[PDB]
Amino acid sequence: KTHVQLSLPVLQVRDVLVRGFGDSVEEVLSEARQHLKDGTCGLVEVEKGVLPQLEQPYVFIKRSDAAPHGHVMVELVAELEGIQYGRSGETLGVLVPHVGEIPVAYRKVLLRK
Ligand SMILES: Brc1ccc(-c2nnn[nH]2)cc1
């Protein structure tokens, strides 16, 4: 399937133990996709002061369309040194590894793979 229904745990930035997916735009998109398949991916909502507390390159989920079965359609966009790789809608958050942090909420998404 081109799209997968996922419920992503929303993490507080100060709880996140692993603050990125790796060291290059291609690696972080690769690892983000692997973690999303393995159910080991979290979401941090972007507010003032969040991104400087995480590791570049960043992987965003961005709205790809205006929401089947309550799931917002999203795609991945990476960012390094102020350049984005991908073009998409509003950010829903920044993806990070999930290693057992307690979430504050769940975000239902339909992920384009
Ligand atoms: Br991104 C992403 C998310 C899930 C999957 C997947 N493959 N099989 N089941 N789920 C692949 C890529």
UniProtKB/Swiss-Prot annotation:
Effect annotated for changing K37R: In strain: Omicron/XBB.1.5, Omicron/EG.5.1
Compartments where found: Host cytoplasm
Domain of life: Viruses
Annotated spans, Disordered: 1-113
Domain CoV Nsp1 globular: 2-113
Described function: Inhibits host translation by associating with the open head conformation of the 40S subunit. The C-terminus binds to and obstructs ribosomal mRNA entry tunnel. Thereby inhibits antiviral response triggered by innate immunity or interferons. The nsp1-40S ribosome complex further induces an endonucleolytic cleavage near the 5'UTR of host mRNAs, targeting them for degradation. This inhibits the integrated stress response (ISR) in the infected cell by preventing EIF2S1/eIF2-alpha phosphorylation upstream of stress granule formation and depletes host G3BP1.
Protein name: Host translation inhibitor nsp1
Organism from which the protein derives: Severe acute respiratory syndrome coronavirus 2
Lineage: Viruses, Riboviria, Orthornavirae, Pisuviricota, Pisoniviricetes
